Amino acid sequence: EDTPQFKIDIDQEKAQALGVSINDINTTLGAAWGGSYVNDFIDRGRVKKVYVMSEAKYRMLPDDIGDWYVRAADGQMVPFSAFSSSRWEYGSPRLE
Amino acid sequence: MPNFFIDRPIFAWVIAIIIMLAGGLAILKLPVAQYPTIAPPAVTISASYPGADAKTVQDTVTQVIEQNMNGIDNLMYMSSNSDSTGTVQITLTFESGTDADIAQVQVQNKLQLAMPLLPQEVQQQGVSVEKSSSSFLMVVGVINTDGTMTQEDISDYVAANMKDAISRTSGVGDVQLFGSQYAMRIWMNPNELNKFQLTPVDVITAIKAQNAQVAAGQLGGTPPVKGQQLNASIIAQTRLTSTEEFGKILLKVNQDGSRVLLRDVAKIELGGENYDIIAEFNGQPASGLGIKLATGANALDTAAAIRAELAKMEPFFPSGLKIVYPYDTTPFVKISIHEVVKTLVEAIILVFLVMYLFLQNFRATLIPTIAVPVVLLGTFAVLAAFGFSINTLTMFGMVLAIGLLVDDAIVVVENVERVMAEEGLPPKEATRKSMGQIQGALVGIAMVLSAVFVPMAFFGGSTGAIYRQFSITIVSAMALSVLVALILTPALCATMLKPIFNRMFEKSTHHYTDSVGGILRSTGRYLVLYLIIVVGMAYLFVRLPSSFLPDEDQGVFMTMVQLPAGATQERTQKVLNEVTHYYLTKEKNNVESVFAVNGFGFAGRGQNTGIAFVSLKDWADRPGEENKVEAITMRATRAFSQIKDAMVFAFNLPAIVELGTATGFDFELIDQAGLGHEKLTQARNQLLAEAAKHPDMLTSVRPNGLEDTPQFKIDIDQEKAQALGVSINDINTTLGAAWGGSYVNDFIDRGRVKKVYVMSEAKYRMLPDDIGDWYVRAADGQMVPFSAFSSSRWEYGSPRLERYNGLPSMEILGQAAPGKSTGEAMELMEQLASKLPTGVGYDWTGMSYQERLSGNQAPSLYAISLIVVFLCLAALYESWSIPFSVMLVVPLGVIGALLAATFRGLTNDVYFQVGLLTTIGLSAKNAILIVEFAKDLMDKEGKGLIEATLDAVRMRLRPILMTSLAFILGVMPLVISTGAGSGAQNAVGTGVMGGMVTATVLAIFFVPVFFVVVRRRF
Amino acid sequence: PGADAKTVQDTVTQVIEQNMNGIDNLMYMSSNSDSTGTVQITLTFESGTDADIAQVQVQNKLQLAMPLLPQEVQQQGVSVEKSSSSFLMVVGVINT
Amino acid sequence: LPAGATQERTQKVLNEVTHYYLTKEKNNVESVFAVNGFGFAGRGQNTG
Amino acid sequence: ERLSGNQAPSLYAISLIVVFLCLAALYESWSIPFSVMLVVPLGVIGAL
Amino acid sequence: LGTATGFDFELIDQAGLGHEKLTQARNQLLAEAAKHPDMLTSVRPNGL
């Protein structure tokens, strides 16, 4: 049955004004929450993946996204909430 | 075996009901089609590198793919074409009988392996591997009379609301689109790019990193933390879905907060992906949807279902949008098959009528009326055994075999009637005696006809399938006919036949016997007369035109317009418009509609070509010979010679869209030393000049390519680019995006993925001087015009480069002069090609390849067939000399067909050959029966070789005349046919009638002579 | 990955499903796409159909839809293979 | 489990199920192999 | 299940026709495989 | 096909022993094979 979903929308103009590019914000969010697959490594002679992801307690609440900062062009740390907004929408988790 | 059934009739009835039920079941599970698969399987790789010339796509796409097309099984050859429009078409032709799916999957696998070597633009466009098959089941055009929607809107609507549902129709193997769906064209303005200090590369980069889709993640995603209670996926970026939404794309902010958007330096709209081809329908804008039938499916059905679906869609259309059918072949095949069925029914009825005329006993005439249809039904079952279909060829083969069906029934029933009328026996005893008299004769006839017809099914090449259809549909008919002569007829003659004009027939028969006796008195003259007949037959056979199949007025034809080199899309118009005006003003009563397509052509795809699919009215509205397609194309091409700008020719579609013009060859020069393209053109010109010196044998020897055309070459000074600080990649990207376009990325319009194209506005990329309006930004924010670091000139280059088997090639077409066989012209062509400059080879492709590979296997097949026929005849009789009396009747049946073909002006095509074989078989059957009766009278009664022969011919005269009158009258409508589909049936009927007249008027005076002269010779 | 069921249904399912039209001996066809981004377009054929020929038919018909699919699935790769619908056996492994 | 359920709650439900099977039906069943996170009605954290 | 339910009566009809035709062919009569076609309901009501 | 009645053998290493331990085991097995000439002959590796 239909499940509530979390929607995060980014202001492109605000992000570019603050010095953070979309190509950085997207991958930062993906690595922090989705979990990014970087490359492979060798474990006991077998090729296995390498995954980067945030620790458990930092990606569990809608307001847990605040402590994630993006490095700006100059070098300052822009908070993610400075250019983003959140909503609680709906959506079918499985369409047949 | 028939004696087993005379006293056991219920078993015969049961095993006939089995045959009838099998045939009825098969009729519904037999596919239906105008034609079977004739051409060998072919797979056509197609690629598109936008904005390139022939040389670029050949060097970067065609050669790379060709070098990786090794390891594919059963590959006859391949040929590739590279057009100046950026298209590459590589056709690989495989062996006949090769599995099409396996060949396609192997080709696509090799292509997938070779894909990483292709340019990025080709990979983005995609390379499509697809099987080539019959042209089109039906072309479903969509037009808008109101004019509110342009062609792009109609094409987008067709791609959205029609292709999805039409593809779901049963029997529709694939669908094609005659246009390009929507795709957002950002029209770069060089003046604003120079003003706002921008470059096309900046626009491309902004659009790329302003519309992409990014993976985001989840809330509370695994691994979860203890106490988590919610889990919702998060969404970050979505593709733009509106014109003004692309308009607000931020390109730059300058320094004073300029905030320049995309719409400031470009116009964003929805247009077509490709503007090369524009299609119209009687002038107003239109689109289309090419439809192809599935591998196994009905043709009458699966085409009416499409019409029903279009009718269902009709209410849910925008105002002014309607559906037209500029091209359809379902009515033609339906009419042809209906005519064939009508011919079969008429044949049955006339057999009934003539058999009542000769045998006044009404109850005797129902015996074939029951027996003849059953065999027909059985034939269908045999087709269901071999996986064939209801083709035109199969139905015409059945039409030819009906003559053997009817006479096989008539001979046995007449023998039964003649036995009980002469000996006064009861029906059972009379039937037993008659079946004893012709017990082995029927089996011998079946074996002889099988030996005649089976080898014709073993011809190789494209023409092999055409002969195979007739061979199967005739051999199966004969095998079932012999069974129904030995099974149902005896039982019916026993249980459905009562015990116990004529005067003139009796007088003629008595006069005929006296004539035969007088001829047998002096047999010397009638042998030299036979030799004269044979010589005349050979003379007529050697001097006769040859053809593949009779071209038929299918209700449509084509008009081709070829503007000279350098013509534009608007120059093809107002010439392609004049053709439409002429067809809809000077031929209103004959032409219903015209479907003009611009920039498609047949030799190339440039803007200087076009074709119109002229669809005539129904045959009921086209009376006379002047309203037929042949009589209209000549008038059109005569009236189109007044045009002194283009070269417009009107012609008719071939009987088979794959291969035609059997008299013509497909010669092809190959460059096997890396000489180049100029030297290959010189060699081709030399060969053409040399062949123009032999007009007696080679006619219309022309190339199949496009001559070199001027092109605008821009050479960039690398030293100047380095000094001025402009990178070569930046210059190349700017030039390609401005003058050729650049497929950037995708977006979502209304729930469908469309492309986003970036290209300059039309007015800024027309003349060479417009290059001066384009500036490239250097490293230090400095704009340099193209006039500073580059120069330009005009040079000749090829617009369409073709390769054969991975080597540069030039295709040369031609035909043999009248009276000269094609194989006699191929030898001259390959003799001329042997005096070319070194390094230039040659090879035959297409139909010429089949003719060269097959060789002269027809005489060998005929020889083995004759040997088997002689062996079967020497088995049926006992003496080795008796079979000659039968094998010397072939010229008697061939001479009449040759006379008919010469008088009617027909051609030695497939239908004529099969009809000749049918007449040969029936005449051989009559000779077999006469000589069997004569031999039986000589053996069982000890007569003196004269009274025996006279009695045999006297008792055989009536069945021969009955069957001749039944079969000549059954093909008279075919000969006098002048309606729809009346070129194939006329061709297959005239020869049969001409052969059958002289295979019975004079053969009855020759078979006794042959038997007598052979008997008193050994 | 990343897209919800609604997004992936129109960009993948609605692009592949309609292409599977002219395939011999096909009874039915059912697809499902969930929020994880994965889709599964099964194709149940008529009984007695040769399985490995239907597989290559489906493969060569699918390859006509790869250009229309978004680039992100291309690096993931579409896997077409003959599939059952129930586990033959389950082999559990424990640590005593 | 209903919409928006985590692994902990479905694990509790599966524990109840396997306890019922291994206690109430101890005479008949001998092994219960619970699989949290996997199901035939799709894949998610609210199945098993 | 729906397909089998739909195709069962045609199977019964074709089996009856085949048996009737083979009996008529073997026993050389039409009345002989008509006194046999009437005992079929007796053997079918037993199964029912 | 056919190795003149000569077997070929594979010293597959399952438990991630590595390459050095695998070649040590191969050397030990080769020594053992050399210790039994009445049953085996020309027992040699196929690798560099």
Side-chain angles (χ1 to χ4, degrees):
Chain A
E1 56 183 11
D2 297 336
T3 53
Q5 291 182 354
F6 196 61
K7 178 77 174 68
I8 314 176
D9 52 352
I10 313 291
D11 297 4
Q12 309 288 345
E13 53 274 11
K14 198 170 308 177
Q16 289 147 343
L18 266 65
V20 290
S21 50
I22 190 167
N23 302 121
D24 197 311
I25 301 167
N26 297 159
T27 174
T28 295
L29 190 59
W33 294 70
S36 180
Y37 157 58
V38 186
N39 57 342
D40 302 5
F41 84 113
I42 303 294
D43 187 20
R44 281 175 294 274
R46 186 178 173 86
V47 174
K48 297 180 177 180
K49 303 173 177 298
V50 168
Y51 274 85
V52 288
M53 190 158 176
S54 181
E55 203 158 331
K57 58 201 193 76
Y58 304 112
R59 47 159 174 79
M60 302 296 217
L61 298 186
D63 73 323
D64 270 337
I65 319 143
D67 56 3
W68 275 108
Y69 294 89
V70 189
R71 183 169 49 192
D74 56 78
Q76 68 169 356
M77 282 307 191
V78 176
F80 182 76
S81 67
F83 51 80
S84 58
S85 304
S86 307
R87 285 172 297 177
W88 272 102
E89 60 190 357
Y90 262 79
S92 192
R94 180 167 172 277
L95 289 168
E96 319 173 38
Chain B
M1 200 254 281
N3 191 24
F4 176 82
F5 286 93
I6 300 172
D7 47 1
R8 176 152 311 101
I10 307 299
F11 189 71
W13 262 116
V14 161
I15 62 170
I17 288 181
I18 301 299
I19 288 182
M20 269 198 287
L21 286 188
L25 183 63
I27 277 155
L28 299 146
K29 287 102 166 142
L30 214 29
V32 180
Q34 199 188 329
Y35 274 92
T37 61
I38 304 307
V43 180
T44 309
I45 314 175
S46 190
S48 181
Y49 185 63
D53 63 358
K55 201 70 180 68
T56 293
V57 292
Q58 186 183 186
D59 293 337
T60 66
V61 184
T62 294
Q63 291 198 36
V64 169
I65 294 181
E66 280 192 334
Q67 292 175 10
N68 300 130
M69 281 305 128
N70 43 47
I72 314 178
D73 301 332
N74 314 326
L75 191 64
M76 293 177 71
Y77 51 84
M78 70 174 148
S79 70
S80 66
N81 306 328
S82 296
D83 302 287
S84 185
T85 58
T87 65
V88 167
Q89 285 258 337
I90 308 178
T91 300
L92 304 96
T93 298
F94 295 84
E95 310 283 29
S96 295
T98 301
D99 197 1
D101 300 324
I102 292 296
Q104 178 183 14
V105 76
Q106 291 176 338
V107 160
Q108 88 165 40
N109 278 3
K110 293 304 171 186
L111 173 70
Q112 277 187 341
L113 288 185
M115 271 286 278
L117 292 151
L118 294 187
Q120 193 65 34
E121 294 81 357
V122 181
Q123 301 181 9
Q124 288 192 228
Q125 296 297 328
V127 188
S128 63
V129 159
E130 45 201 350
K131 311 186 297 289
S132 60
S133 56
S134 62
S135 175
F136 290 105
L137 166 63
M138 172 177 43
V139 173
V140 182
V142 187
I143 75 169
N144 175 256
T145 54
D146 299 5
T148 64
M149 322 198 299
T150 183
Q151 179 207 347
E152 284 74 23
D153 305 342
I154 305 179
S155 54
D156 172 78
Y157 187 87
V158 169
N161 311 89
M162 293 180 183
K163 287 190 57 175
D164 291 316
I166 292 301
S167 301
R168 205 140 41 249
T169 307
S170 61
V172 182
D174 62 82
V175 296
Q176 198 263 3
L177 184 51
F178 268 69
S180 305
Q181 59 169 357
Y182 289 152
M184 193 88 58
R185 320 288 288 186
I186 296 109
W187 297 109
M188 272 143 40
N189 202 310
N191 298 329
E192 280 77 1
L193 303 168
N194 189 42
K195 181 175 73 175
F196 282 109
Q197 298 298 110
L198 279 164
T199 178
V201 188
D202 288 334
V203 186
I204 296 177
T205 303
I207 295 160
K208 275 184 176 175
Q210 265 272 12
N211 198 22
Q213 183 97 29
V214 303
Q218 289 194 3
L219 292 172
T222 48
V225 74
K226 324 322 181 213
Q228 183 69 13
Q229 296 287 258
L230 73 164
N231 165 263
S233 60
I234 75 175
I235 316 295
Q237 191 82 6
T238 48
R239 292 176 169 174
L240 311 181
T241 179
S242 189
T243 303
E244 69 270 15
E245 194 169 2
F246 291 100
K248 302 178 185 63
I249 284 185
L250 194 144
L251 304 175
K252 183 178 179 180
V253 296
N254 287 337
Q255 282 73 29
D256 52 350
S258 64
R259 274 279 318 281
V260 65
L261 305 178
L262 184 57
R263 59 163 177 257
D264 287 340
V265 308
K267 307 182 308 181
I268 295 91
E269 66 165 344
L270 273 74
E273 300 172 352
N274 189 359
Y275 281 97
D276 195 3
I277 294 180
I278 52 176
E280 290 181 350
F281 181 88
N282 304 331
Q284 53 205 338
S287 168
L289 199 153
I291 301 190
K292 276 180 168 51
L293 191 62
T295 187
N298 204 287
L300 321 176
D301 202 65
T302 299
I306 301 183
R307 294 177 182 262
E309 281 192 8
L310 271 296
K312 178 197 61 180
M313 284 162 176
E314 275 275 3
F316 293 99
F317 282 168
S319 68
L321 192 77
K322 57 184 53 56
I323 314 298
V324 294
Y325 301 83
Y327 182 76
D328 193 1
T329 56
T330 303
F332 177 77
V333 55
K334 187 172 64 64
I335 294 170
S336 63
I337 290 180
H338 170 76
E339 296 265 40
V340 175
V341 175
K342 180 182 305 175
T343 292
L344 292 180
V345 168
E346 284 186 358
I348 297 169
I349 299 299
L350 311 163
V351 175
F352 165 88
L353 294 177
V354 63
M355 212 185 158
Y356 186 86
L357 183 63
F358 277 80
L359 321 174
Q360 270 67 12
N361 188 21
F362 171 84
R363 197 163 280 97
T365 68
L366 300 200
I367 303 176
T369 300
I370 301 177
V372 170
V374 170
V375 190
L376 287 180
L377 271 297
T379 293
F380 296 108
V382 186
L383 300 189
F386 291 160
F388 283 175
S389 55
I390 301 299
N391 290 138
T392 285
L393 314 174
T394 59
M395 311 325 268
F396 274 108
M398 273 164 55
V399 158
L400 295 191
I402 206 69
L404 311 192
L405 295 174
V406 298
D407 65 359
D408 177 16
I410 295 169
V411 64
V412 60
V413 186
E414 201 281 333
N415 200 38
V416 177
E417 185 72 19
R418 189 264 302 168
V419 163
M420 64 183 73
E422 187 179 6
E423 307 183 17
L425 302 186
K428 216 177 191 65
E429 281 71 26
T431 308
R432 284 176 179 165
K433 193 176 189 60
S434 62
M435 291 332 288
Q437 288 182 350
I438 58 174
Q439 182 64 256
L442 299 184
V443 176
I445 289 158
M447 292 304 173
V448 163
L449 297 193
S450 284
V452 162
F453 284 103
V454 172
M456 149 187 78
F458 289 101
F459 285 75
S462 304
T463 176
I466 298 184
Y467 284 145
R468 185 203 207 73
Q469 299 292 291
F470 295 98
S471 169
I472 298 284
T473 198
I474 291 181
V475 167
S476 61
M478 291 313 315
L480 287 161
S481 176
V482 58
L483 270 298
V484 183
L486 304 180
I487 287 157
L488 197 55
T489 39
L492 280 179
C493 292
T495 76
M496 185 180 288
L497 192 60
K498 293 293 188 290
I500 311 178
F501 161 74
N502 299 336
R503 310 165 52 183
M504 301 145 257
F505 193 79
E506 296 295 332
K507 290 154 55 180
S508 59
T509 299
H510 282 187
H511 172 40
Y512 170 68
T513 296
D514 308 336
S515 181
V516 176
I519 293 180
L520 288 179
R521 286 287 312 280
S522 56
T523 185
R525 300 169 287 104
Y526 292 86
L527 265 295
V528 70
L529 192 149
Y530 176 74
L531 288 182
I532 292 303
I533 283 185
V534 169
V535 167
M537 176 265 295
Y539 156 75
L540 278 175
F541 182 76
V542 64
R543 186 202 58 81
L544 198 68
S546 185
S547 175
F548 194 39
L549 271 174
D551 54 332
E552 186 62 27
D553 50 311
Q554 296 156 123
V556 308
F557 69 95
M558 301 215 168
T559 311
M560 181 195 68
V561 182
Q562 184 82 18
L563 270 298
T568 62
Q569 191 181 8
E570 297 112 342
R571 278 173 53 180
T572 302
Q573 293 298 110
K574 91 182 71 176
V575 167
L576 197 54
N577 283 318
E578 297 308 317
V579 176
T580 288
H581 181 261
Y582 163 85
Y583 276 142
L584 273 69
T585 53
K586 211 161 304 303
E587 292 189 7
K588 305 178 305 302
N589 44 27
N590 308 333
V591 165
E592 189 175 8
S593 69
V594 64
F595 195 86
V597 175
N598 193 330
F600 182 76
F602 275 145
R605 209 176 157 269
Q607 303 183 27
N608 58 345
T609 65
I611 52 173
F613 315 130
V614 193
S615 79
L616 298 90
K617 295 187 178 300
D618 204 331
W619 296 273
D621 304 333
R622 287 152 51 195
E625 293 179 353
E626 64 185 343
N627 291 20
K628 300 308 173 183
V629 163
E630 182 65 26
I632 283 188
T633 55
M634 64 183 73
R635 298 204 305 274
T637 190
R638 168 161 281 98
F640 288 157
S641 67
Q642 322 300 327
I643 297 179
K644 260 56 185 177
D645 294 331
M647 171 215 88
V648 184
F649 293 151
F651 60 93
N652 180 21
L653 294 174
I656 280 166
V657 289
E658 318 298 330
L659 284 84
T661 69
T663 177
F665 57 89
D666 208 333
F667 185 74
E668 192 153 21
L669 283 187
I670 315 297
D671 174 62
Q672 313 207 21
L675 303 174
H677 175 79
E678 304 98 290
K679 293 176 71 68
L680 194 55
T681 48
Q682 291 174 9
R684 173 184 64 93
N685 297 330
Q686 169 181 348
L687 192 144
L688 291 188
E690 204 169 16
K693 294 183 176 71
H694 301 64
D696 66 325
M697 185 179 288
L698 299 168
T699 51
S700 71
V701 173
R702 67 195 182 280
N704 195 19
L706 311 179
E707 274 70 18
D708 293 5
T709 66
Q711 298 176 338
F712 198 64
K713 169 158 192 53
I714 315 170
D715 48 354
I716 301 172
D717 292 331
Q718 268 76 20
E719 61 281 1
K720 288 186 178 177
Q722 295 261 2
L724 300 173
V726 288
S727 50
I728 303 289
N729 289 271
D730 196 357
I731 304 167
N732 292 333
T733 304
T734 296
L735 196 55
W739 296 73
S742 183
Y743 161 58
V744 171
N745 60 330
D746 295 0
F747 86 109
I748 299 184
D749 189 16
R750 300 178 193 96
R752 308 192 65 86
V753 171
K754 326 274 193 177
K755 307 185 175 184
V756 174
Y757 275 89
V758 162
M759 197 185 159
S760 176
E761 212 184 309
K763 65 186 289 184
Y764 302 109
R765 49 158 170 79
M766 281 305 128
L767 298 177
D769 59 78
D770 296 324
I771 299 183
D773 297 2
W774 286 99
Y775 297 90
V776 192
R777 179 165 43 79
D780 47 349
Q782 190 74 19
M783 311 285 177
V784 194
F786 269 78
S787 315
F789 53 81
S790 68
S791 74
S792 60
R793 63 185 170 281
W794 289 86
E795 58 176 24
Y796 276 76
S798 189
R800 172 174 169 279
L801 289 159
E802 61 184 0
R803 307 166 63 83
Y804 189 70
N805 276 330
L807 297 154
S809 77
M810 301 265 188
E811 200 174 32
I812 297 183
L813 301 177
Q815 299 174 18
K820 283 84 183 180
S821 63
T822 180
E824 175 187 37
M826 309 208 317
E827 59 91 17
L828 173 62
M829 207 62 169
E830 65 193 6
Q831 161 184 324
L832 292 179
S834 59
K835 293 169 289 185
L836 284 185
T838 183
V840 172
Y842 73 94
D843 189 358
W844 306 97
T845 185
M847 71 215 88
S848 316
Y849 184 86
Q850 324 283 349
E851 298 171 14
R852 196 262 321 277
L853 177 67
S854 70
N856 301 122
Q857 65 183 177
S860 60
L861 282 189
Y862 288 152
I864 187 66
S865 176
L866 197 66
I867 287 306
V868 176
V869 159
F870 168 79
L871 292 177
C872 293
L873 285 179
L876 171 53
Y877 325 120
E878 275 303 295
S879 170
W880 284 116
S881 58
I882 305 183
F884 293 149
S885 299
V886 184
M887 311 215 298
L888 298 154
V889 74
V890 176
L892 312 184
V894 174
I895 184 75
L898 287 182
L899 271 43
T902 53
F903 166 69
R904 275 295 193 183
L906 288 185
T907 318
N908 185 19
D909 51 355
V910 165
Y911 293 134
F912 173 80
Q913 294 182 28
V914 184
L916 190 71
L917 264 70
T918 285
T919 54
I920 286 173
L922 197 155
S923 52
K925 179 172 195 168
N926 296 343
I928 281 170
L929 272 183
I930 287 184
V931 68
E932 165 74 19
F933 271 21
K935 175 209 166 190
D936 277 6
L937 287 190
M938 291 215 318
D939 290 2
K940 299 301 180 180
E941 301 179 10
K943 294 191 172 182
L945 178 54
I946 294 304
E947 53 269 12
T949 303
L950 288 192
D951 288 7
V953 66
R954 176 207 67 82
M955 65 183 73
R956 286 311 304 172
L957 174 64
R958 186 162 81 176
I960 290 180
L961 296 191
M962 271 155 78
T963 62
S964 302
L965 188 153
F967 182 54
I968 290 306
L969 267 58
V971 304
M972 205 47 195
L974 260 53
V975 179
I976 72 176
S977 75
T978 177
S982 57
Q985 58 195 5
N986 200 334
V988 71
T990 291
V992 173
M993 182 179 72
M996 191 85 268
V997 164
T998 80
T1000 54
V1001 175
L1002 62 80
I1004 63 181
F1005 294 97
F1006 267 90
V1007 179
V1009 173
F1010 287 150
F1011 174 66
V1012 160
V1013 76
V1014 172
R1015 283 256 50 79
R1016 54 204 296 267
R1017 184 63 178 86
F1018 295 82
Chain C
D4 49 316
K6 265 298 299 177
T7 292
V8 73
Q9 180 170 263
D10 56 62
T11 186
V12 178
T13 306
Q14 274 279 5
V15 176
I16 299 183
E17 207 172 22
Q18 86 285 8
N19 290 29
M20 313 298 172
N21 45 19
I23 312 182
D24 302 3
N25 296 115
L26 179 64
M27 311 186 308
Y28 50 88
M29 182 179 71
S30 57
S31 55
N32 65 87
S33 48
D34 62 337
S35 287
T36 311
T38 68
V39 48
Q40 279 214 121
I41 315 188
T42 321
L43 295 174
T44 320
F45 294 93
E46 293 179 358
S47 185
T49 307
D50 183 358
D52 63 358
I53 298 298
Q55 195 259 13
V56 311
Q57 286 178 341
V58 167
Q59 183 183 329
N60 67 45
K61 184 63 69 177
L62 168 81
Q63 291 318 313
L64 269 299
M66 290 295 267
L68 297 168
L69 295 190
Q71 183 69 23
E72 181 195 350
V73 302
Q74 310 277 351
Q75 65 182 357
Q76 315 295 337
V78 290
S79 60
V80 65
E81 78 282 354
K82 307 174 301 175
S83 68
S84 181
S85 186
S86 52
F87 295 120
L88 162 75
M89 62 180 286
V90 171
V91 186
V93 178
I94 67 179
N95 182 275
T96 57
Chain D
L1 260 66
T6 49
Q7 264 193 354
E8 286 80 18
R9 307 198 296 183
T10 177
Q11 193 66 32
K12 304 314 162 298
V13 175
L14 284 174
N15 290 342
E16 298 182 19
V17 163
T18 186
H19 178 272
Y20 165 88
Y21 275 140
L22 292 182
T23 56
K24 294 286 192 56
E25 307 281 351
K26 55 173 56 180
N27 315 286
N28 300 280
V29 302
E30 66 176 354
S31 70
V32 191
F33 191 78
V35 182
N36 178 13
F38 172 81
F40 292 112
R43 292 273 310 279
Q45 302 188 22
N46 59 321
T47 53
Chain E
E1 178 176 0
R2 182 185 63 184
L3 188 145
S4 69
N6 288 17
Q7 80 179 15
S10 69
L11 169 72
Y12 295 151
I14 193 66
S15 298
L16 281 179
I17 297 169
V18 169
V19 169
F20 167 86
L21 287 187
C22 75
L23 273 193
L26 180 53
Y27 292 163
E28 312 286 339
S29 181
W30 298 106
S31 57
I32 294 306
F34 182 76
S35 45
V36 179
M37 291 294 105
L38 306 151
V39 71
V40 174
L42 306 179
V44 167
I45 196 178
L48 291 177
Chain F
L1 294 174
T3 54
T5 72
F7 67 95
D8 60 356
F9 186 75
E10 303 285 333
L11 209 66
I12 174 174
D13 171 30
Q14 285 84 11
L17 288 190
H19 184 64
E20 170 61 30
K21 306 188 65 61
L22 184 52
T23 191
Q24 291 302 323
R26 186 201 69 175
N27 296 331
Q28 189 169 354
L29 186 137
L30 286 188
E32 295 300 326
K35 284 181 176 58
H36 300 67
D38 59 74
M39 191 36 88
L40 298 175
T41 183
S42 73
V43 173
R44 47 153 180 168
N46 199 24
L48 314 181

